[PDB]
């Protein structure tokens, strides 16, 4: 996170860390949607262009963390992955359309004050909340600047940006499955995700029932906190049917 701030303890019980077994390193962000299901971006698991292609055995999932580097004893829970499910139509050759993937933990995790799942939106909540100017929140242990590492989990709240503006800021064909977000050059406020943040959750709090819903997934961006550029996120509700499908079927 660039231009963000230290998260409060317990602020994101659903935040998850994608940890590489060897070398022991931070790969991506993720979120806990159930006691056995973690949601993250697909590009985190597979991306031929950068020779990336991990399996269940290559990594660990770390839940309940606050500090990036320290193994938080008695607090955090590390689990193993049973099965990884990437979207059958993940366009990694072009625009990362449908940048989404599911992960099934080997054994359920137990919730605590630092570990709790986030809700997936329903059409209404999505309809009503996903509107330009409406602010969401991103979290992560990624880079503090485009070109260093924070000590604890960072947080930043960004406004959703008009579809026309998003399109006009990039050379990349953006699909209905994506939505960008961030401040405009003039708004005099900054903030954006960055390396090591992708995979993470972009949530919003419903003013109707007081719950937190994850509206997007940190997908891709060109640089970090650059003027006139915005971050793009996977439209989670738009692909909920695949999420339910996988969950139910498997």
């Amino acid at each position: 996170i660039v231009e963000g701030s230290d998260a409060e303890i317990g602020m994101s019980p659903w935040q998850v860390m994608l940890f590489r077994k060897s070398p022991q390193e931070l790969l991506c962000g993720a979120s806990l949607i159930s006691d056995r299901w973690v949601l993250t971006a697909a590009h985190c698991l597979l991306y031929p262009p950068w020779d990336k292609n991990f399996t269940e055995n290559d990594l660990l999932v770390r839940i309940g963390k606050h500090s990036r580097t320290r193994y938080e004893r008695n607090i955090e829970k590390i689990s193993m992955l049973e099965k990884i499910y990437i979207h059958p139509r993940y366009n990694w050759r072009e625009n990362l359309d449908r940048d989404i993937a599911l992960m099934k933990l080997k054994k359920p995790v137990a919730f605590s004050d630092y570990i709790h799942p986030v809700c997936l939106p329903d059409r209404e909540t999505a309809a009503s909340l996903l509107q330009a100017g409406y602010k969401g929140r991103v979290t992560g242990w990624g880079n503090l600047k485009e070109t260093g590492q924070p000590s604890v989990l960072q947080v930043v709240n960004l406004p959703i940006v008009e579809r026309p503006v998003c399109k006009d800021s990039t050379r990349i064909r953006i699909t209905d499955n994506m939505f960008c977000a961030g401040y405009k050059p003039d708004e005099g406020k900054r903030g954006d995700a960055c390396e090591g943040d992708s995979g993470g959750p972009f949530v919003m709090k419903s003013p109707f029932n007081n719950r937190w819903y994850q509206m997007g997934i940190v997908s891709w961006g060109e640089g970090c906190d650059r003027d006139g550029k915005y971050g793009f996120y996977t439209h989670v509700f738009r692909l909920k049917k695949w999420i339910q499908k996988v969950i139910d079927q498997f």
């Binding site: 022991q24 320290r70 590390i78 193993m80």
Partner: peptide, 12 residues
């Protein structure tokens, strides 16, 4: 810097 050692239970 770098990360801290995590229990070996988790690395097998």
């Amino acid at each position: 810097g770098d990360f801290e050692e995590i229990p070996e239970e988790y690395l097998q």
